[PDB]
Design a protein around this ligand. Structure first.
Ligand SMILES: O=C(NCc1cccs1)[C@@H]1CN(C(=O)c2cc(=O)[nH]c(=O)[nH]2)CCN1c1ccc(Cl)c(Cl)c1
Length: 301
């Protein structure tokens, strides 16, 4: 029993983190086989931030301008190239700790573990969701760029996020490991801001199932709703539409608890319209939307 924000064990990723320094800028890199990946903004200077031409900036670099350190060991850079918004630094040593891995772009609403790193040294690990607006509500300080997000399946690390920036509201934005930004954000100085966000309905339902499995039943009722009627309420409260595929995805949790998905939707409707009346669900006085159905199945009986 119990239900926590639970990250994947980070050891396989820890062995891949390195420090990358160019000029006076230091950030983190990801060392897999004989390549180190890092944000291309490592080559920026504050004196050219409006519209940096990264192709020009990189042409003016040499391998020796990049200082790469794995712990106390310096890795010799033997090639450099740009892929979208990431830099690929070829090094003369393959990382002996390279896990089995994939580069996999995630969908808004999915979750992943973040290994926050500073100076190539891992500092902490926590669970995040990709918001509908393509930001993440992370916890990152100066020097955190190049930290990565990932999921682990069996022995295989699926890298999905590399950290690039903190937006004015304190939320975070980054790229997949092919260097393509999540959402409409750019690695140049602008007034860019997080767009309007919504609540991840399928995840809230998953979390209500987690609560039932953990003995919280006070929000249950005898009523059911239709998908159409529920989605009218979802719209009013800035929740994402619920699809039949979401309903299907929630099947296993519905079967384990014996509560039909549309039955649980009727509970969610009442919670949106009435609040909780001073009660809590899984230790929260709000509706939590950062656990996917998969996350719930992973922790629940
Ligand atoms: O978001 C930034 N600056 C605003 C922007 C300027 C242009 C685009 S965004 C980050 C902030 N930053 C951190 O180390 C840091 C990270 C964090 O999460 N929290 C935190 O307090 N600090 C230094 C690098 N810096 C940056 C510099 C150049 C570029 Cl091009 C980019 Cl993308 C990022």
């Amino acid at each position: 029993s119990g239900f926590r924000k639970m990250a994947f064990p980070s050891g396989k990723v820890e062995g891949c983190m390195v420090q990358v320094t160019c000029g006076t800028t230091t950030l983190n890199g990801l060392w897999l086989d004989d390549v180190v990946y890092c944000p291309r903004h490592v080559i920026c200077t504050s004196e050219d931030m409006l519209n940096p031409n990264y192709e020009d900036l990189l042409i003016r670099k040499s391998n020796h301008n990049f200082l790469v350190q794995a712990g106390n060991v310096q890795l010799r850079v033997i090639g450099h190239s740009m892929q979208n918004c990431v830099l690929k630094l070829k090094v003369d040593t393959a990382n002996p700790k390279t896990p089995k891995y994939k580069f996999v772009r995630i969908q808004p609403g999915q979750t992943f573990s973040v290994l926050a790193c500073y100076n190539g040294s891992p500092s902490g690990v926590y669970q995040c969701a990709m918001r509908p607006n393509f930001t993440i509500k992370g916890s990152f300080l100066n020097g955190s760029c190049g930290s990565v997000g990932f999921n682990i399946d069996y022995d295989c690390v699926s890298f999905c996020y590399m950290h690039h920036m903190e937006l004015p509201t304190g939320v975070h934005a980054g790229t997949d490991l092919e260097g393509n930004f999540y959402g409409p954000f750019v690695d140049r100085q602008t007034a860019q801001a997080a767009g309007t966000d919504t609540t991840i309905t399928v995840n809230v339902l998953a979390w209500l199932y987690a609560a039932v499995i953990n003995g919280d039943r006070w929000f249950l009722n005898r009523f059911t709703t239709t998908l159409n009627d529920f989605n009218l309420v979802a719209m009013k409260y800035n929740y994402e539409p619920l699809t039949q595929d979401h309903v299907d995805i929630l099947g296993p949790l519905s079967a384990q608890t014996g509560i039909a998905v549309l039955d649980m939707c009727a509970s969610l409707k009442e919670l949106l319209q009435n609040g909780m009346n001073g009660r809590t669900i899984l230790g929260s006085a709000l509706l939590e939307d950062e656990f996917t159905p998969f996350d719930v199945v992973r922790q629940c009986s």
